[model samples]
Each structure stands twice: as structure tokens, then as C-alpha cells.
Target: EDVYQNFEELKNNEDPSDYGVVTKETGSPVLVLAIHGGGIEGGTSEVARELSKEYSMYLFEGLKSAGNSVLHITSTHFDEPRALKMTGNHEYVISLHGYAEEDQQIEVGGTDRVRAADLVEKLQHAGFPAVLLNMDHPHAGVSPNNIANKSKTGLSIQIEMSTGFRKSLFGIFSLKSRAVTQNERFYEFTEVMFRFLKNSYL
Candidate 1:
């Protein structure tokens, strides 16, 4: 597959874990990861890192370069050693991903069905289009190899966001922008999700 091929290229050239992956131990059992971060998935790493600060959650960010059209490792195939170590140490994991869908929506999935449902409801309440993924959904993040499911507790939430929502979060018209530029809705969105995670798990 092209995904594996891209990862192979990345692995052969440089340590995929060393490039865009940033890990921090916040002493919290909850961990946040953006494996398809940086130019790979756009806007995910920024929001994941932002939420990490308020919750003191451990974070792993992949900063692979390339924009607009870039290489993206499937969630199940993302296996950076440092990130796996953190996942083993943490009780729960939340992964952020981006998709290029026509509608502005968030698809919630993972082994942690309860958390996924809760998050979907919360996002909908906040006026965002969020829904749980069906079993056959391509980006469901249900495979055991998926990093989110690698948590010590064996439960995790994977949030798949559309390009439209991601763009609006940073008020950017270009997909080439690698980071969030601080928008009000962005802050509110992260705050709401953070609070929910804190209250529900931590």
C-alpha cells in the first residue's frame, strides 16, 4: 500500500519518531496523540498539544512535512516506539486525525465506545456535526494495531475531523498552514473537549 510505502521511505531516510513526534509525560494517566500531525494531517497536532496543556495529559505529536497533498500513515500502522511506550504507561488514550470529506463533521471511533458516544454527543451539543463511526467505516480506528487501542487500559477514543472543521478552527483558508492561529471557536472547541475528558475519565 502507498501508506506503508510512504512510511518505509520515512523510516529509511530518518527516524519517523524523531522528526515530528513530541512526547511529554504530564503525570496524568490520560494520553493524547496526534500521529498524523504536522503537514501530514493538518491542525491535529496543534489542537492535541493545546488540549494536553490544560489537562496535563501526556502527548505525542507527529510533525511530518509536506502540505496540501502529503503522506499519511494509517492509524493502525502508526507505531513510533516512543509513542507506544507512552501508550503503555497511560491508562487511556485519545488520538486526533483529519479527513478530507465534503461535510464539516467529526467521526468518533475507537475501542472505547462509551467515550466515543459521549464525545459525539458533546460535539453535537456544541453545534458541531459529530457522529459515531459504523463498523465498516474506513477510518474507524478499530483495529488492534491502532495506537489508541494500545493503551494500558485497552480503551481509547479516536476523533476523525473533516478538513472544513479543521480549517475553521484556525481561520485559515490554506491547508498548507501547519499550525492553528488561535481562533475563538478553536479555543471553545478544545476547552469543551478537554473539560469532558477531565470530568469523564480523569
Candidate 2:
């Protein structure tokens, strides 16, 4: 269902002004990503940014005034040069994404089944509705080329939160207010994710 086959051709037709890429390399073994951020999958970049506190981060945000979905390049098809370089150096990766389910549910996915299962438990204990990845899931971050699983370790975790839950994190569900109006729920969610990585990773 992805419109663009890859990042290469996306750049050919899309306007640079409609998107932005942000990367912070901390020389950490872990890398956090939000490939469909900003208007594309609102609130994902916010989650990724907070989770990257002591780790490296990569975010490809859609800055368009509207129709941000067009900027979305599937995780398996995402081959941005810098993203690849960042993945090559990292041993762990955690990616955030948004899904269309209106309920506040979460799908924990990635090639790392053990890690993904742990995340599912952690999220469920926090009172967040969560489940492990399945073949039937809308987006399973299991493909070898998937941005979430493409790190040097080749095993990582991916979170696909519901649109309803994502919107609840902000006072207003608009991108303009995302940075300033993130409520307590937002911090609570990211803190759990951050802590999981901090304890599980070396």
C-alpha cells in the first residue's frame, strides 16, 4: 500500500520543503527511529525523540501542510543513506509508528521476538493494551530490511500505537501543539520504553 518504492525515488518527486530528517548520533549502541513522523504519523517523532535521550536517533518527518501520508515510505523500503549508516553502527534499534485502530491498543513487533515479547509485557503491565507481533498484524517489523530490524544486531523492537492513544498524549492532536502540549500520558509511555531499553541493553 506504500506509494513510494524507496527513498531514492521519493526524493526525485517530493519537495524537500515538505519533509525533514533529523539525526543525533551519541555513539550509543542503541538507535531509535520514527521514519513516519510529524504529520505523517503524528506523535511518533515525539516518542522517538524522548526515547533517544541517551541513545542515537533518526527521524524522517513529514512537514507538509497536508497529505502527509504521501511522504510515508514503508520500513522495509526505507533505504535512506544516513538511516543505513546509522543502522550499521548500532546494535539495538527501537522504532515508533502509528496505526489506524481507533482504540488505544499497541502492537509490539520486530525480528527480535524475545525483546518484542518483553516489551509487550512491560506495556501491558503499565495498563496499556498491547500484544506481540503476528503475521496478521498490519505492520510487523520482521523483514530483514525493515528499518526497525536493520541494525547491526539484526534484531530490534518496534511499537505501533493506536491513533486514539497517540492523540490522547497531546492536549490538542495538531502537530503545532505537539511539542508544547504533551501531557503526562506521553511521558509515562516513553519512560517505560526508555527504561526497558536501558535495563535490557548493555
Candidate 3:
């Protein structure tokens, strides 16, 4: 629970080694990375676990799931190093996260409005139920785009799952387990995502 107490604390304690990685050596033109479901080792592994199930159950089960390579960062704890590390690669980046004490709604975060809009439209059409959280607010999730990197040129997004959906730690656990077993909503969501990516960049 030692989440950053202040900017100074974060600056002093920041460690580039804290970043998490998956499928590092895999070679593919398309790539996906998550930035928040990890680090400092806290919270129920709701989104990350669901992502694994989705990908493993169906490779490229969603957009970026099929025939593509991905790496979910899991934590924003080490942004600079991660960004630098990602430079000079053709890949899409997504940072998955959850909100605390905020409104009850799913949100997508990133710098590109058009891309974000495309994702929103796909999610809506798929009946996933999400809201455009705060694309204009730099203080919100879109803050990461300002950084510079080669591979970083690709589009990046921040997806915030509503904690309301997962009432408690146990609720998150149950919901995720159900998501894996049922895989209906999960597949639906990922399929919509696939269409979006296909239409947008493909």
C-alpha cells in the first residue's frame, strides 16, 4: 500500500527494474502493452488475469490477440525506462487500470482522440458499456503520450475498468473467475476490440 505519497517520494524511490513484461522475445509486427495492473504487488489481479485468459484461450481473441505479440506492463511505476525501452518498434500500447472512489464507468485513456473514438465506438457497438473518460485532460490517463520514443510512436491507450463491476476483492476474484469460465462477455469484448483494430489500422 505504499502507493506514491508525493512527487518527491516517487522521484526518490523510482526504480526502472519494477516494470513487468510478458512475451518479451516474441517477434511480431503488432504489439500491445499494459501499464498499471502491476507493480508494488497490490490489488486483486482482475484485469491482468482476464487478459491472459482471453489471449491464451484465443490467441488474438481480440484485436491484438490474433497473430500478434503483446506485453502488458502492469504498472506505471517505471514509465521513463519502459517508454525508452519501447522506442523504435511498430506496436500499439494499452495501459489497463481501475479507478478508486471515482464514478462508476469504464474509461479509455490515451492521446489520440480519433483512435480513442474508434475504440469507444467499437466498445459501444459490442455492448461492452464504457464511457469516454477523459481524453482532453492531461491530468487524466492521456498524460503518457507526451513522452518521446521510437516504438512509442504507435497509438497508446489507457483502459480503466470500473471497480463498481467488481464490488470487493472477492467480487473481483469471482467476476474474473466467471469471466474465464463463461468467456461470453470476455470474448464479446475482445471481438469488438478486434474489429476496431482491424478497421482502424489492419
Candidate 4:
């Protein structure tokens, strides 16, 4: 369950400095996000950074030394100002997130069926276990209110990468370790996603 409705409430009670926000407005064809990043969701920020290399990016990372779970706000309720601003303008939005599945698989879902299906094809072609999730699963990300869907096109993508997959990308899969220990596998995964978007132009 989320304790905060939006960034406004979270910043009100929590030390804003305990978290980090990095945004790049590159005027690229798309916008990428890692809202549940940093210690809150390990390995995601790195993916966010790598995949957004030639694209625009908005990342939020929990910088607290411990108990970063307090910053884990659900996407439907996440209304960080800059995030809203970026997503509002860009029609192509893709958000990356981590889930607790103990397998090396990606559950792909979002409001846009075209992008979601396209991603499933590319990820599976790259030998990454990929599943196309629909409205039933909690990870489906179909809500119009979700930041990913707030884009100008009213469509977006969200991929829930399994914890096991994320673990395989890091030599040591901890909050501190991931910052410095993203192995070659991490780059490979990000590249696959980047390739997916290279052909995803609307």
C-alpha cells in the first residue's frame, strides 16, 4: 500500500534530500521513467539511465541509507511535478519497474497494445522471457491515471522485470552494489530495450 498520494504529500513529511531526481529533456522521440528507482527499486535507475541514453529520461531514486521502502509510491498515485510535466508533453512514454518474481522474465503491459505487443516480440526474440499481461494482472498498467498513460497519445508502456533477472545483471545485487556493479548483462538488457524503441516511433 502507498502512504502518500503524490509527491506533494511525500515531500511534506519526508526529507526531500533523501531522494534524488534526474531528468533530461533531450527533445527525443520518447520519454523513459524509473519512478521506483534507487534503493526503492534496485537496478531500475541504471536501466533507466542506459535505455534513455539517446532518449529523454526522468528518474527518481531513494537516497536514504536504510528503509527506502518509504519512497515506494505506486505509479497510479505518483504525481511528481516534473514527471507529470514530462509525460504530459511526450506522447511516447515507457516506464521501467522491478517486481518480486523469482524468475528471469519480464511482464509487459500498458495502455497501448501496439507498443506492448511490439516489446513482447523484441524481448522474446532477444531470449528474454517476456509475457504480455492484460487487464487482469495487477501489473497490467491499464489505468488512464497512471503516469505512463498521461502522455499526449494517451498510451504508454510499463515493464515489470523480475527480481531474478535484475539479480543476474549485477555482480552484487544490493542497493550499494548495483550503483557500481552493473555487469555486462545490464548493458545488454538495456540495449535490447533501446532497440525496441528505435523502431517504436509513433
Candidate 5:
């Protein structure tokens, strides 16, 4: 069966308790994913959605599930049918995640080392701590089964921003209140990354 048809069937058979997946096709050949969206992973969903809208790329967002919990599926184990279908449809995939490390840094990983280095440079230049994840790191997204590496072009990017950085982007200490406005640095950071992806192989 076709990817979309498979996605439809999978969605129909999904457990009601699990979070629903949403997709938007913009014909950009680039897909943005926020698998641990909502309070499950904090600011990732917002950031991923913004990038998707800005670049007119496809988006796959996992909605919040019951209680204060969400389906916190890891990248390597991301076998959700909607996610698989979206990944199959796109040439490049960019996945956003939140990290609990106290350091305000962004850990970049995935199969696209060049693009990852470029992003690291840009973020560092902007005064944010950004580094490419090596094999020694725990969250290294180098595995073949990683959702970031499951793209049609065999290249992808996974960016894990520190919780503090994500919180600051929305100008909040806690996730209680709604994000009324994004800080200036947040816009600057996203702009740089967006421009790089737009000019690069996105």
C-alpha cells in the first residue's frame, strides 16, 4: 500500500489513549517533526511548528495525550505509522527535541554532519553553546534506525536544545502560563537556523 494509505490505516487502528498525529504537506520535500510535543518535551513542538510554517515544509506533530504526560517516543524507536509515512514522503527530516542537561547548549546530531557543523557554528556565533554530538554522547542520533536518519535522502538533522534554552525562548520559567511572546534571541536563533536550512539542502 502507498505511504499515505498506510498512514490512514494506522491512524484508524491507533489506540484511543495514545496521542494523535497531525500532518501538513507543503510540498517542500523537507519535513519537520516534534514527536515529543507539548509538555512532554516542552518547547520542541512550538519551535518545530514555527520552522515548518516558515519554510513551508511538511510537519508531523504528536499531540499531548492523557494527564500531564505525552507519548515520549525516542528517536531511534520512532515507528509510529504517521511518522513513518511522513518520513517516507520527505527527502530531508529535521527533528527537534528537549534535553534536561543544565548547560544551556544545543546538541546537534544525525547523518548530516556538514549541516550539523554549520548549525553549531551559527549557534556558537550567536553566543549559544552548540556542539555536534559525537559517538561518546548518549543522545547521539547516529543510529540507522533513528527517525532523523530515516529520510528518503538518507540525511537528516536532530537538534536537542537544553531545557533552560527552550524555556527562555518562550520567556517562561515554568510551563504553567501560555507563551505570550518569544524573546529576541529566540527569533534570532530560529532565523539563523532557518536561513541555513533554506540555503542548504532543505
Candidate 6:
């Protein structure tokens, strides 16, 4: 949902995952965020509970109603930390992650807007369905660029995929299994995005 570090632990503690208003780190213009598939199961059960299922909805509604800038730090699994520390001075920052039965096209869905078209094109070239969603809105998620530039700064979008994409390909073949590709597509995917950012921003 928001920023899940440990769903089960957070659930046991009834503590909300990491949801906070992040102050722009000095010199860093980009604010990276990962929204879905965060670690730290909110409930004891592996599956999302009714409340947890609606967590993102609740967050979206709250941000919509309150008109707040929301930043998310998500994880693919409990032990994955590579995406968490991805922050710096830039036009924007975004960490992408997702879950599904098999690796589908990578989607760069977010509220931020910057050099999205170019980023999406690069991702598409690398075999992803990257696109910026929720761009047109007055009351929506936080736009760090907007905050920094009075709604005139650059924006960054975080892209994530379902477990099916990150999981082994065999997982996809098995009805009960998830899509898991041992070809290290996930790492390659991240590397591509990183290079894209470096080429585009740095």
C-alpha cells in the first residue's frame, strides 16, 4: 500500500507502514517512491485482509480529500532493501515495484509528471509498458516537483510490477505458482531504469 517494510509485523503492532511527509533532501531534486507490494504484511495472514486490501484506497481517498503530498517507499519482499534508499537531489525520485502471476509489461503508473514521456519511451524500448497515469488532477498524490517549484518543478514517477513478473517463470506455468523468471529480468529491469534515469537526468 503506502510504504510497507514488514506487513506482518506492522499488522501485529497495528502500526501503519512508513507513511510520512518527506522533506526534500538538500541537493536532491527527485523524490523516489514505491507504492505497492511493500514488505511488512499488515496482517498475520500472507493474504491481505479486508482492511489491508483497502489500505491503498484509503490512502488515495485521504490524499484526495486532504490535498496532501504523499511519498511511498515500498518493497518487493520483506528482505528487499535495494529500493528503499533510492533518494537524492533531482527533479524527482521514484522506485518501481509490483506483483503478478507473470512478468507483464512494466507500468510506470503514478501522479508525478516530469519527463515522463521520454522515460516511458526508454522503458518501452527496453520492453516495458511504461506510462504516466493520474497526471491530470488538482487534488491528488504529492508532487515533489510541484512542492519545490510551486507546481512548476519537474516530476518523477515510480514504476512497479506484479509478483508474477518478478517471480520465476516456472511459477507462472504452475497454476499455483507465481511468475518467477530466473533469467534475472528483475535486476535487468531495475538496471535499465537506473541507466535511463542517469541518461535522462544525470
lDDT of each: 0.73, 0.86, 0.44, 0.86, 0.69, 0.37
Arrange candidates by TM-score, descending. Answer: 2, 4, 1, 5, 3, 6
Q: Return the TM-score for each candidate structure.
A: 0.85, 0.95, 0.58, 0.95, 0.81, 0.45
Per-residue lDDT tens digits for candidate 2, residues 64-129, read 889999989989899988999898889888888898988888888887788789889988898888
Q: Which sections of candidate 5 miss by over 4 Å?
A: 1-18, 56-70, 173-179
lDDT of 5 by residue, 34-129 (tens): 776766677776677678665433333434333324345566766777677778888888888887876687889878888888878877887888
For residues 33-145, could you state the per-residue lDDT of candidate 6 as single tens digits? 33332231111111111112212111110112221112222322322122233232234545434444344544554444555556778877887655555555332234443
* Candidate 1 lDDT score relative to the true structure: 0.73
Lowest summed lDDT over 10 consecutive residues: which window, candidate 4? Answer: 193-202
Worst 10 residues of 6 by lDDT: 54-63
**Model 6 stretches with alpha carbons more than 4 Å out:** 1-31, 35-91, 99-103, 111-114, 134-154, 168-183
lDDT of model 6 at position 132: 53
User: What is the Å distance of residue 72 in model 1 from its true position?
Assistant: 2.2
For candidate 2, the clash count comes to 0
In candidate 4, stretches whose alpha carbon ends up further than 4 angstroms from where it belongs are none
In the order shown, what is each candidate's alpha-carbon RMSD? Answer: 3.0, 1.4, 8.9, 1.3, 5.2, 11.9
TM value for model 5: 0.81
Which lDDT tens digits does candidate 3 get at residues 95-124? 455555334456776655677777877787
Question: Regarding TM-score, does 1 or 5 come out ahead?
Answer: 1
